[PDB]
Amino acid sequence: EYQNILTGVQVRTAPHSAPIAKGIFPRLGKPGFSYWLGKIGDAQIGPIYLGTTGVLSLVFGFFAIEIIGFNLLASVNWSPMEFGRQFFWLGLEPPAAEYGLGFAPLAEGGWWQIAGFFLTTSILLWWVRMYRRARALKMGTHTAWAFASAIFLFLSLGFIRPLLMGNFSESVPFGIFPHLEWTNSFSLNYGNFFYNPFHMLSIAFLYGSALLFAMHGATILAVSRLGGDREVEQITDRGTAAERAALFWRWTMGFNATMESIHRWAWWFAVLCTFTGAIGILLTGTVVDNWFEWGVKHGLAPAP
Amino acid sequence: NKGDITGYMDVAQVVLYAFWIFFAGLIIYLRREDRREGYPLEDAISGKINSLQGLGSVFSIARPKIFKLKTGATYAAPNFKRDAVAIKATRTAPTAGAPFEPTGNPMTDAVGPAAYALRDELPDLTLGGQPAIVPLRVAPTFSVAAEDTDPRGLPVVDRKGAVAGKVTDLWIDRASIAIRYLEVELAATPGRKVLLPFAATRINAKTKSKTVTVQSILARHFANVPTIAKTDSITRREEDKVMAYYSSGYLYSDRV
Amino acid sequence: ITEGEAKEFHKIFTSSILVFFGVAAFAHLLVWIWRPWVPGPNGYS
Amino acid sequence: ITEGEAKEFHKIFTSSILVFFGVAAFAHLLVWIWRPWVPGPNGYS
Amino acid sequence: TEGEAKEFHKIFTSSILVFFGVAAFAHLLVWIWRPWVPGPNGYS
Amino acid sequence: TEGEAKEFHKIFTSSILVFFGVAAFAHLLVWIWRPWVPGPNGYS
Amino acid sequence: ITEGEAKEFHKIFTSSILVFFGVAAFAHLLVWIWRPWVPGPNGYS
Amino acid sequence: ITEGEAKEFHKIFTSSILVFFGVAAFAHLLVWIWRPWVPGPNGYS
Amino acid sequence: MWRIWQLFDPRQALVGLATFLFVLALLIHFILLSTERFNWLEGASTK
Amino acid sequence: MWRIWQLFDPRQALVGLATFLFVLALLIHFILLSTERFNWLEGASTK
Amino acid sequence: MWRIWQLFDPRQALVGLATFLFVLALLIHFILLSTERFNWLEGASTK
Amino acid sequence: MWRIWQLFDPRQALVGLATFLFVLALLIHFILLSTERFNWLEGASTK
Amino acid sequence: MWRIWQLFDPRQALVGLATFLFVLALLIHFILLSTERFNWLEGASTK
Amino acid sequence: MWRIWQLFDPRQALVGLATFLFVLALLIHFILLSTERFNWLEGASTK
Amino acid sequence: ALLSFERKYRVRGGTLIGGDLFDFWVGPFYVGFFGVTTLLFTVLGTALIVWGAALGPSWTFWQISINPPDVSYGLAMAPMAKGGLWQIITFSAIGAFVSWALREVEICRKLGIGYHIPFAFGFAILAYVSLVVIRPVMMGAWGYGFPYGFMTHLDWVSNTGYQYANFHYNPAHMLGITLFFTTCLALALHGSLILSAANPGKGEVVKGPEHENTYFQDTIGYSVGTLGIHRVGLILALSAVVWSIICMILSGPIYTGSWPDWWLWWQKLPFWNHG
Ligand code: 07D
Ligand SMILES: CCc1c(C)c2cc3nc(cc4[nH]c(c(CCC(=O)OC/C=C(\C)CC/C=C(\C)CC/C=C(\C)CCC=C(C)C)c4C)c4c5nc(cc1[nH]2)C(C)=C5C(=O)[C@@H]4C(=O)OC)C(C)=C3C(C)=O
Ligand SMILES: COC(C)(C)C\C=C/C(C)=C/C=C/C(C)=C/C=C/C(C)=C/C=C\C=C(C)\C=C\C=C(C)\C=C\C=C(C)\C=C\CC(C)(C)OC
Ligand SMILES: CCCCCCCCCCCCO[C@@H]1O[C@H](CO)[C@@H](O[C@H]2O[C@H](CO)[C@@H](O)[C@H](O)[C@H]2O)[C@H](O)[C@H]1O
Ligand SMILES: CCCCCCCCCCCCO[C@@H]1O[C@H](CO)[C@@H](O[C@H]2O[C@H](CO)[C@@H](O)[C@H](O)[C@H]2O)[C@H](O)[C@H]1O
Ligand SMILES: CCCCCCCCCCCCO[C@@H]1O[C@H](CO)[C@@H](O[C@H]2O[C@H](CO)[C@@H](O)[C@H](O)[C@H]2O)[C@H](O)[C@H]1O
Ligand SMILES: CCCCCCCCCCCCO[C@@H]1O[C@H](CO)[C@@H](O[C@H]2O[C@H](CO)[C@@H](O)[C@H](O)[C@H]2O)[C@H](O)[C@H]1O
Ligand SMILES: [Fe+3]
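^ thats the input. predicted complex w/ dodecyl-beta-D-maltoside below
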């Protein structure tokens, strides 16, 4: 009874990759092989492409990470021991309300603003990198727009809502426990963030993404004895694996997808999980002061 | 008050209803994409184009999108190429919901879990315009990685323990580096050679000796495995046929 | 199924309809005698 | 479907639907007698 | 197809006239019970 | 076989009667212990 | 589609949209008589 | 697409858009008669 | 009217109609049960 | 009406009907047990 | 308008109309039930 | 203007237009129901 | 300016233009509804 | 009911009835244990 | 009513229970014995939910709630009016879920595919059971299950989360959140890669597995593979559910205190316990 959960016998060949124009930068990384990764998936590692947008994104991101880490280490007076003790509790806090959207003093949130700007720039440059890498390989840019949804949520959390409130004071800090505490206090300040309906939609789409990527993973693993793992080939030439995958769900559920359209569902659930989340974040504080009172007004709560 | 639009209606509610409209449209779009294979629906008995469908029918089926291949080929989705109503089976009851009694050996008649899609007779292509599923003999560069049992020469047995045959060669996918098939020479017929999918094997590297076992079909069922033509490059239809035959074992491996 | 065996099954099916309905009617009569379930204008009791 | 059975099926359907409608109408009449469901311009006094 | 288009349209018109007639009778009865167009002073 | 159906029906109806008899005896024992049909004023 | 059937469809569509717009305008006039929706300098009342 | 209808579309388009604007501007004029949307130095009213 | 069975299969029409009628009856019965006036089990006075 | 068994196979429609009847009976019993007058185990007084 | 059946199959139009009007009847009835005036089950006073 | 139907399937155009018009009508009706003045079911006074 | 349709498909461009104009009009209407001065449903005073 | 087992598998029927009867008896026993009067383990007073 | 390829796999057999009695289809659905049983449990549970809505004060779909019995009843069966209805709905839901999974098993056997899908659904069933059976039994009362209501089960989630004063600090909860977010990210990447390979643009012939591998080799530096991605995705979702179950068993049955100050153990390891 085999399951295609682990690859008992592996194959290793001469590393090769799809052809790209040389460009200013070559492929970098001297590809190698790994055993556990080949047990769970492919064994080859790299090479990683590092173009102009890749260099720009890496430099901006590294600057942001170094600024954040330097501030975290400085907050505990440069003690490696006490840095270890408080690492989770350490955080680069955003500037206070009084400074508006302008530059705060470095100790009072200027470093947070500089780090956030550099991180935003690196994330956007990484988005451009995904777009350009997809276009270079003569492929579509679905990954870029799926990423753009996540960037929308990130910018709504960090920049857009501060713009609307005219204030970075309620932005999320750069810390492990501090950003969870920001989540908790954001929910408390605005009345039981469960009563945010776009939060409910985002949770529905997150649950649906997990559900869908368990359903689809189990379906492809169930038809992997029939060439079902080779999804694009079953999309261009429908084999019996795709037919049985469709008929299983048609018989158990009443309807079914295509090998191509199931990944459209997969794309859209993931994208909507963050799109509705960004909308719900942009709506709180600006339009809806208290989500519990909005729910009471609109029939979500028994009106105490 | 601050966020209202008309008395009871406010901005958050309006954006919510806008999302609901967008999600209804998105569900329609996704269902249109779903209805790109196997559509339109046929009658369960006669096979005429019929189904309990409303005003959404005009929007149910999308125009055929065109897939371009790196050979000049083209696929149309949906292509309204359907299966024949008359299959090698008979209705248990004439009620359009009843299942089918096979009218023969369903292993070799391609009925039920043995049924295979009527694909095209072309091997999968690599980036270089060559077959992807090839035996290791005609791919000198490819080799089996170490730290894994080499499945060459190991006895091929069923669940009952009878030695169905012996493995001589491995067939692998060039596009994705992994073993696809084991070439098995029959202990009962040297002049016969069969392909057994790698997904249907247990490694069995931890026992008294090393052997390859199959839990689906019995030893005698290896005498009727579908054959292939080129013996060094296998078409999509041939591989789909072989995989369907092997997958049919679990349902009726002991007669019908 | 044929047109004759359908009638043959319908006979025993009708017999079971009558038996089930009679038992249920007796049950409802007993419950009504115990506690009626149609309230009056002033309620119950 | 074969039209040779539509004549029979529609007559059975009509008889059964009139039976069902009449039973429902008698039940509604009984409920209205017990308690009408259309208030006057004062409520349910 | 025009083979049964005329007769289906005739039966459809008969059915939809029956539907609208009974719905209008229902609305008339509802209006006699309680009108749904408030006056300048609301409901009284 | 067809005779096996008759033999199964005989043994099954014997089991039906014995099971229902023991169930009725148990219900009668419980009813003597505590009846489950309350009066107009309740049990007490 | 051919041009003749397009012209016929356009004629029927024009008549239908004329009837729809006339009935909708009639409904709007009745609603305006009931309660106009354009307020004045002081509002509605 | 062939030029033979590039004008055939355009002649309709450049007319239809005009009609659209000819309606929309009209609407705006009415709104300006009702409530102008350009405040003065002391604000609205 | 009998031409409706030249559009719709009678077996599936019967099963779907039975299901719809049963669900509707359950709904109306439950709605009446939640109603103060028409709950024949709780049986509050209508006066 | 004897023809209904041409539309529905007795061997399976009978069992489905038995299941539906059991569900309905058990639901009605649960509803009665949920009430205050028709709960024969609580036995609350009508007066 | 007898020609619209060249565009719309009578089965499709009929099923769609059945479903749409059932949903609309449910919606209007539920809106009436949520109103103080036209809820015929609690029968609240007009004045 | 009769040429638009050469661009669009009349079935597509008609069904899409009916859908859009019904959804818009529902939207407008609900917006009026949300107002204090144009809600015809509670019927708040003009004054 | 009639060569624009040699670049843009008249059907796709017309559909996109219609949808964009509808969303823009809807947004402008809701923006006016949000404002006090131009909300025609409450009808607040200019002063 | 002469030979009803020429239609129903005696093994499947026996297993299904055993499971159904066990589940129903467990449900009734738990319902009695939920009560105040027929909980033979708590043993409350009839008077 | 059949797909273009459906009237080829509609063979009998593959049923665990029922023989040929329920081996048939109704419309698109396969019924089987376990389809009958899931109808039995679903109809009864939904009818009981609607009955509890009738007993409730709202009929507002989001304010309809079925509450479990008060904790003062312990693990006892409760009267149907007050707590028992929630218990019967719980049992009916468990039976319906099990029937659903078993019917999926029969469909898998009939189509001759692996049983991965019912096994994966077993984890969702286990999460529900842990929320309504296992955890309430360990905690000693049925009132620790969540109410069956749209917004009221969210009130339960919030109340139980703030019972430990910050439920984020539950480390198993952190790990489950990490797995859920990673599952969503991996699903986005996988759907995007498949769509981009299948729909590469104007011209742009359909790309092969090598192009898909090359994309993530260039962008990330590693590519899992068109088979291994479904593996890792199923494992990600199942592990997220497993760690959520673990974090809910840890809260109440095992840990009955503030999760935030559970982490003081970390603060006081001997190589930085400055004191
Ligand atoms: C007490 C807390 C309170 C409580 C009531 C509660 C409970 C629950 N919630 Mg919630 N939540 C509350 C608050 C709250 N909640 C959210 C969000 C969500 C979404 C996130 C989706 C996602 O993927 O995010 C995650 C995606 C992001 C943030 C966007 C993409 C991120 C990117 C590209 C970052 C790129 C990073 C690098 C390149 C690395 C280098 C950088 C550095 C080193 C610095 C999701 C659906 C979700 C789930 C649940 C569940 C399941 C529950 C349960 C069971 O109770 N919550 C966010 C949101 O969208 O809200 C609308 C948000 O902002 C916010 C707030 C304030
Ligand atoms: C559908 C919604 C979905 C949600 C649930 C979701 C959530 C979260 N997604 C998260 C993180 C990331 N997401 C990503 C990438 C961006 C990388 C970046 O910005 O680099 C740009 C930054 C930086 C350069 C800064 C640091 C740099 C470091 C640590 C290295 C420093 C050292 C250096 C340079 C020197 C040494 C090395 C040399 C070579 C010299 C990261 C890993 C991406 C995508 N999300 C998508 C979607 C989703 N993301 C899609 C479709 C994606 C992409 O396409 C893209 C990608 O590359 O995916 C592989 C997080 C933390 C999430 C949570 C839960 O909070
Ligand atoms: C490589 O590193 C070595 C040295 C080992 C170690 C270095 C660093 C370490 C250890 C770093 C550790 C970092 C940690 C723990 C980070 C935790 C980060 C988390 C969890 C962040 C989570 C959320 C934060 C978000 C979403 C913040 C978003 C902020 C944004 C988008 C702000 C944008 C602000 C802008 C654009 C400001 C504009 C204003 C001005 C005018 C200033 O712009 C010019
Ligand atoms: C100003 C505030 C801070 C924000 C940062 C602004 C500068 C960084 C973003 C600038 C815009 C980048 O936009 C992108 O630039 C790079 C060159 O740099 C170009 O891309 C270039 O590098 C790519 C890397 O894959 C190579 O294929 C090739 O050498 C060339 O195409 C893209 O054609 C352009 O789309
Ligand atoms: C299997 C299907 C079974 C179907 C069973 C259907 C039963 C339907 C019963 C309908 C007839 C009931 O009619 C109802 O009778 C009871 C008698 O207790 C009357 O009740 C009246 O009399 C009783 C007894 O004196 C007093 O409480 C009081 O005077 C008043 O309530 C109701 O005013 C009447 O409306
Ligand atoms: C499947 C069967 C479906 C049957 C559906 C039946 C629908 C019609 C039922 C109600 C018909 C109208 O019934 C009629 O309503 C008017 C209100 O205008 C009421 O009028 C009567 O009672 C009210 C007070 O309750 C008095 O103010 C009024 O003077 C008196 O005439 C009565 O209740 C009844 O005479
Ligand atoms: C085609 C569709 C799009 C149409 C777009 C139309 C845009 C142009 C509309 C406004 C044009 C300017 O309109 C002009 O504004 C100035 C502003 O001081 C007005 O000036 C006057 O009006 C204001 C209004 O409160 C008074 O307080 C004050 O006495 C004076 O300033 C003019 O009386 C008006 O004619
Ligand atoms: Fe996939």
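The two ends of chain A are 58 Å apart (CA to CA).
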